[PDB]
Amino acid sequence: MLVVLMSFGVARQAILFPNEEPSWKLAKNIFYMPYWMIYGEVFADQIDPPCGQNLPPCKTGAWIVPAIMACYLLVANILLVNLLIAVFNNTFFEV
Amino acid sequence: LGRKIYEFYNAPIVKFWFYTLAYIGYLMLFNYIVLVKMERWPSTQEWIVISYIFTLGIEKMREILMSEPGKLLQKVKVWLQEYWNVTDLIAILLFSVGMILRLQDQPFRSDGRVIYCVNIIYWYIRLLDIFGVNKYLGPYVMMIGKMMIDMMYFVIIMLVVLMSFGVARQAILFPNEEPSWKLAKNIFYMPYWMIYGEVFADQIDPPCGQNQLPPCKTGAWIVPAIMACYLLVANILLVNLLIAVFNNTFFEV
Amino acid sequence: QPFRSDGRVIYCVNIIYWYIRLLDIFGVNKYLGPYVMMIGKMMIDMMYFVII
Numbered sequence: 001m002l003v004v005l006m007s008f009g010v011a012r013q014a015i016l017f018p019n020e021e022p023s024w025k026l027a028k029n030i031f032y033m034p035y036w037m038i039y040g041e042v043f044a045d046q047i048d049p050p051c052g053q054n055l056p057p058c059k060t061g062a063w064i065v066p067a068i069m070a071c072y073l074l075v076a077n078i079l080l081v082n083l084l085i086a087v088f089n090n091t092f093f094e095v
Numbered sequence: 096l097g098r099k100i101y102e103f104y105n106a107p108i109v110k111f112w113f114y115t116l117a118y119i120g121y122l123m124l125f126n127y128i129v130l131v132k133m134e135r136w137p138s139t140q141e142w143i144v145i146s147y148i149f150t151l152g153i154e155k156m157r158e159i160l161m162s163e164p165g166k167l168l169q170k171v172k173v174w175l176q177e178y179w180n181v182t183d184l185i186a187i188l189l190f191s192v193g194m195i196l197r198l199q200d201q202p203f204r205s206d207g208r209v210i211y212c213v214n215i216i217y218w219y220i221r222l223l224d225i226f227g228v229n230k231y232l233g234p235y236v237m238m239i240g241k242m243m244i245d246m247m248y249f250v251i252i253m254l255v256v257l258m259s260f261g262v263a264r265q266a267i268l269f270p271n272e273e274p275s276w277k278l279a280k281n282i283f284y285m286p287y288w289m290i291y292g293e294v295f296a297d298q299i300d301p302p303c304g305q306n307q308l309p310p311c312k313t314g315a316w317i318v319p320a321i322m323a324c325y326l327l328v329a330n331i332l333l334v335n336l337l338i339a340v341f342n343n344t345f346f347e348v
Numbered sequence: 349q350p351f352r353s354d355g356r357v358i359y360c361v362n363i364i365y366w367y368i369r370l371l372d373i374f375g376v377n378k379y380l381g382p383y384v385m386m387i388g389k390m391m392i393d394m395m396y397f398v399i400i
């Protein structure tokens with residue numbers, strides 16, 4: 001999880017927020033909201049903010065963030081977690 | 096000294112621990128350079144990172160030329176068999192084009208910073224290859240590799256169902272829009288995040304026409320029911336099927 | 349109208365079914381074909397869950 005979770009966390013804090021002076025909040029914003037989306041809350045209002053409709057301007061071509069996060073939620077909440085399901089199941093009789 | 100330094104720095108475990116500690120160090124420096132503002136000339140950290148990328152490209156070229164076949168086309172086939180090698184080539188290439196875009200000036204700079212970010216993705220996933228020395232984690236990553244094929248199926252079936260609600264939610268709720276590409280964003284926007292939690296409780300069943308909301312369109316009472324059938328058929332019918340398919344397959348892998 | 353409006357609705361209920369008929373075309377594959385095979389067999393197990 002740490003490797004795939006970190007990947008999305010670094011990516012979302014670098015697309016959305018494009019210009020910040022170096023500070024320790026950045027690591028918190030990596031290890032924040034992505035971790036809490038493997039547990040049920042996708043942070044829906046944060047995701048696809050409305051933008052440039054007569055609001056602050058569009059950060060970059062920030063269309064990467066919903067797509068790679070969709071890939072992340074598939075990878076995290078389905079494959080890995082289901083792997084732990086299977087791993088626990090087959091080691092269970094063994095122990 | 097000479098023999099102990101040369102013996103020790105040529106033991107393959109030691110040179111492994113070089114290459115992985117240097118690769119973790121690169122990951123930390125590239126983390127810093129992607130989560131900081133970047134001025135027009137590169138910073139020191141970025142110079143170390145781009146040095147890593149181009150020296151890695153030189154070493155890839157070294158072992159392509161130093162491969163065992165004598166014909167050059169033979170050795171480029173030898174290198175294009177193995178999977179992680181070709182993903183190295185495409186990613187070192189895409190970091191190179193990020194560098195050439197970001198040495199320029201706006202509007203190309205913001206695009207180049209995005210290109211750096213989509214490199215951050217892959218250079219994270221290469222740690223899965225790096226974690227192949229462990230006798231305990233090597234099998235897990237091989238398992239993931241076997242479970243991905245089963246995912247290809249689930250995903251396909253899901254698409255059919257998601258899209259089916261997606262079309263129906265798009266037409267029945269929204270009645271009189273004009274030809275636009277937002278229909279596709281809405282087709283895969285609202286009925287996709289529902290399989291992981293958020294059911295969009297306000298967005299579903301708004302009260303219509305009472306102090307006033309616009310009088311609710313056509314026969315839009317049907318969208319909660321086909322929504323209900325969708326949530327059952329996705330979250331219980333398939334996901335659970337995928338649990339079963341992983342358990343059967345995992346045993347053999 | 350207003351039948352027009354209701355004529356729009358029951359077109360849209362149809363594309364629910366005509367999407368699900370693409371599962372038939374997925375049946376011909378050597379591997380997707382067996383996966384839709386198990387879906388119908390699990391659906392009788394869910395019918396017992398939907399009552400409970």
Ligand SMILES: CC(C)CCC[C@@H](C)[C@H]1CC[C@H]2[C@@H]3CC=C4C[C@@H](OC(=O)CCC(=O)O)CC[C@]4(C)[C@H]3CC[C@]12C
Binds near residue numbers: 024127
């Ligand atoms: C993926 C994880 C494990 C590592 C991620 C690394 C970064 C998120 C860290 C590593 C070095 C850190 C920096 C080290 C020292 C400082 C100095 C510190 O400066 C001050 O407090 C005041 C400075 C001034 O105004 O002179 C601000 C935080 C900062 C930039 C830190 C911000 C967070 C950084 C970039």
Ligand SMILES: CC(C)CCC[C@@H](C)[C@H]1CC[C@H]2[C@@H]3CC=C4C[C@@H](OC(=O)CCC(=O)O)CC[C@]4(C)[C@H]3CC[C@]12C
Binds near residue numbers: 023024
């Ligand atoms: C490897 C796994 C198993 C554990 C990794 C733990 C770290 C990722 C955590 C533990 C301590 C955390 C830090 C604890 C306190 C702070 C200070 C906090 O900075 C401030 O409150 C000052 C700046 C400001 O308030 O603006 C920023 C988050 C940070 C660096 C945290 C970032 C994330 C850290 C390094």
Ligand SMILES: CC(C)CCC[C@@H](C)[C@H]1CC[C@H]2[C@@H]3CC=C4C[C@@H](OC(=O)CCC(=O)O)CC[C@]4(C)[C@H]3CC[C@]12C
Binds near residue numbers: 051052053062066287
């Ligand atoms: C089903 C699986 C494959 C997931 C599919 C997800 C993507 C195809 C969707 C999900 C959310 C969508 C985004 C949601 C909203 C917007 C905002 C929209 O922004 C603007 O029009 C900006 C206007 C301006 O320039 O100010 C651009 C499309 C975009 C990024 C969408 C692009 C397509 C996305 C990433």
Ligand SMILES: CC(C)CCC[C@@H](C)[C@H]1CC[C@H]2[C@@H]3CC=C4C[C@@H](OC(=O)CCC(=O)O)CC[C@]4(C)[C@H]3CC[C@]12C
Binds near residue numbers: 258274275276
């Ligand atoms: C179910 C999935 C897999 C496919 C769904 C298909 C549609 C969502 C796409 C396919 C073709 C698209 C169309 C292709 C080109 C155009 C032209 C475009 O025209 C303009 O922007 C200018 C119009 C003008 O003022 O003349 C309007 C969107 C539209 C109709 C697109 C709307 C979205 C469409 C219908």
Ligand SMILES: CC(C)CCC[C@@H](C)[C@H]1CC[C@H]2[C@@H]3CC=C4C[C@@H](OC(=O)CCC(=O)O)CC[C@]4(C)[C@H]3CC[C@]12C
Binds near residue numbers: 276279280
């Ligand atoms: C088969 C699965 C695994 C992937 C399918 C991917 C596509 C169905 C996605 C990926 C890219 C998406 C597009 C990315 C960007 C846009 C532009 C966006 O249009 C605008 O922002 C301009 C109009 C406006 O904002 O007013 C509308 C959604 C659309 C066509 C998205 C529609 C859905 C697309 C084609």
Ligand SMILES: CC(C)CCC[C@@H](C)[C@H]1CC[C@H]2[C@@H]3CC=C4C[C@@H](OC(=O)CCC(=O)O)CC[C@]4(C)[C@H]3CC[C@]12C
Binds near residue numbers: 302
């Ligand atoms: C047992 C499992 C498989 C499904 C259980 C849930 C359904 C029985 C519920 C959930 C949502 C409900 C629907 C939510 C909203 C409406 C709109 C409602 O229309 C109005 O209220 C009129 C317009 C207005 O004034 O709002 C008619 C009932 C209906 C279709 C409800 C019928 C019963 C539904 C489908």
